[PDB]
Design a protein around this nucleic acid. Structure first.
Ligand SMILES: [Zn+2]
Ligand SMILES: [Zn+2]
Ligand SMILES: [Zn+2]
Ligand SMILES: [Zn+2]
Ligand SMILES: [Zn+2]
Ligand SMILES: [Zn+2]
Ligand SMILES: [Zn+2]
Ligand SMILES: [Zn+2]
Lengths: 111, 112
DNA sequence: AGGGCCCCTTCCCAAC
DNA sequence: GTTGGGAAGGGGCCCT
DNA sequence: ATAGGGCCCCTTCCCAAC
DNA sequence: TGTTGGGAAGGGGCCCTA
């Protein structure tokens, strides 16, 4: 369930997820694309890469017809139609539409 | 409880008794206050470091020249003039840096 | 218990 | 100054 | 044999000085 | 302009004491 990496000593969660993390140290990339033969450290990244060769964006917006490569990217897009800005800075009260936009504002100062 | 997940951000915090310290990063609580300048701190060890401003203590002394410094990074920087050593080196560039964060922002800033 | 698969985060940087 | 696509990496969840 | 406080180490970060 | 660097923020290991 939880284990420390023998190289970086950071805690890795999830059973069987340690070899995947160690590949970020060793750099080994077992999964290879059948077309461009670019190698990848993880299988889910290679699967996403194969869609780049076809241009497939399977997740479509119901309102504007916009296509996205990831289903969670489509949920981020729905905020354009709903106008919802769920992230807010408790010091400024300024709102954002993505979490990293709020994270960028907090690491600054003078706010 | 050498390892525990924070009840707020669900991230793993290591070390016994280290969770309330991490919780204060969420709440902003500053229970440690310098009684001279009234500046508040979230951690006791950060208060001790701040006390050196008033005591003038420079506990980091060089073993060769004997110069005293207030922070460990001052001594490490000062050791460079005794050595000439630049300790951090990229391998996809063989470019040399003086601090660790200089190498990190070089491996993540376009370029090579 | 470990493999797919997906969700989620920040970082970079460009379009706007 | 705001938005967002791509990518790296971590963790939850399902199934066999 | 153990848990918590103190203490000091390390890192990346912003961003200003050089 | 690029490079250097001071200090903040935060996480983790070691030691001492109960
Ligand atoms: Zn590691
Ligand atoms: Zn390919
Ligand atoms: Zn839409
Ligand atoms: Zn704000
Ligand atoms: Zn937390
Ligand atoms: Zn003070
Ligand atoms: Zn010296
Ligand atoms: Zn390089």
């Amino acid at each position: 369930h939880m284990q420390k990496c023998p190289i970086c000593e950071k805690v890795i969660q999830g059973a069987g997820k340690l070899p995947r993390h160690i590949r970020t140290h060793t750099g080994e990339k077992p999964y290879e694309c059948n077309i461009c033969k670019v190698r990848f450290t993880r299988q889910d990244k290679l699967k996403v890469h194969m869609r780049k060769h076809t241009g497939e964006k399977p997740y479509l917006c119901q309102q504007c017809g916009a296509a996205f490569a990831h289903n969670y990217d489509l949920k981020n897009h729905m905020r354009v139609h709903t106008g919802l800005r769920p992230y807010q800075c408790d010091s400024c009260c300024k709102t954002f539409v993505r979490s990293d936009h709020l994270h960028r504002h907090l690491k600054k100062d003078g706010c």
